[PDB]
Amino acid sequence: MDLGTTTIVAGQGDFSAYNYGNNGANWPAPSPAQVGYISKGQRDVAYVNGDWEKPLLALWAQWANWGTTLYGYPSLPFPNYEFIWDIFDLPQADYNQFSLGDDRITAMNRAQNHQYPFPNNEGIPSWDRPKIDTFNGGVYTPAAAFAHYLTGKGKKMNFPIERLNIKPNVKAMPQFIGVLTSSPMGQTTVDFNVPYATAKDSWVAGNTVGEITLRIVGILVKSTSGQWSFRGEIRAYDDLYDFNPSNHRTETAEGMTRLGREVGQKFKDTTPYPIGIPGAIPVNISGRSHH
Numbered sequence: 001m002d003l004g005t006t007t008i009v010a011g012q013g014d015f016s017a018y019n020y021g022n023n024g025a026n027w028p029a030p031s032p033a034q035v036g037y038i039s040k041g042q043r044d045v046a047y048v049n050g051d052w053e054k055p056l057l058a059l060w061a062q063w064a065n066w067g068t069t070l071y072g073y074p075s076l077p078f079p080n081y082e083f084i085w086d087i088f089d090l091p092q093a094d095y096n097q098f099s100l101g102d103d104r105i106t107a108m109n110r111a112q113n114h115q116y117p118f119p120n121n122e123g124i125p126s127w128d129r130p131k132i133d134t135f136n137g138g139v140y141t142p143a144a145a146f147a148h149y150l151t152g153k154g155k156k157m158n159f160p161i162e163r164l165n166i167k168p169n170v171k172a173m174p175q176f177i178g179v180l181t182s183s184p185m186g187q188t189t190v191d192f193n194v195p196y197a198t199a200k201d202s203w204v205a206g207n208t209v210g211e212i213t214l215r216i217v218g219i220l221v222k223s224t225s226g227q228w229s230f231r232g233e234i235r236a237y238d239d240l241y242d243f244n245p246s247n248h249r250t251e252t253a254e255g256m257t258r259l260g261r262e263v264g265q266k267f268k269d270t271t272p273y274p275i276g277i278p279g280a281i282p283v284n285i286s287g288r289s290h291h
Helices: 016-022 032-047 053-063 079-100 104-111 141-151 174-182 250-265
Strands: 186-197 211-222 227-236 239-241 273-276 281-288
Touching: 016 032, 032 053, 032 079, 053 079, 053 250, 079 104, 079 141, 141 239, 141 273, 174 186, 174 211
Parallel strands: none
Antiparallel strands: 186 211, 211 227, 227 281, 239 273
16 A cells, blocks of 8 residues: 655666667667657656656647746657656556555556557547546556546546545644533534645645545543543545645646646646545544643
């Protein structure tokens, strides 16, 4: 279960698409297609460590002729095709981690184990992939969230609450402190809602759903001794993925914001969609008043 906190070591050669491109026996003559295969290698090197915005901006910038930095990536003959296929592969890769427990490199290679015809106007690629319905919460998750934005056609995605990798401190919540001090002696049902900036705890979550709304629910007991115990769960309400500028990572925020305003030009099904955040985080706390 890889929630993308740790870095790994990776080189172009770890990637099958790259090795396929770099195998001379496969190409009797120079070819833009061969270049495409090669290019996937270095981008993949960034992807496995969650550095996902740069590779895509570099491609889009060429495509849209921004005349801006390519972050060190080679210019390509068909930046439009590599962009499109990446948008295709990235969600499969995320799903491969969640579905099969694939390691990062394996997930990407499995994702890229297919034919790469030129992106079409009619069915290439085929974007209808209903089975992909849950995020891993790892290095591919944000990019996958973006890909479902461009091509998901509004279908619901799930981000299981435990994969958010958040660690809400209930005792520290003003609302919970309020309830604790103002609730009556004896047994009380607790139920309130609190905004939670997930970026504080988890870059993946902050880069995908950002601020969410949590629901704290359970039973609170206050004893006349001043002891107290709370027994409940944290749940979460659906988020709406709408490519919110507020969720952009600083370094490429500008690029991503620009991209946001342009992408709908070529990705005509681009639409916000709901992200369910199913499940609950167990809460078992206690302590005592100062009185």
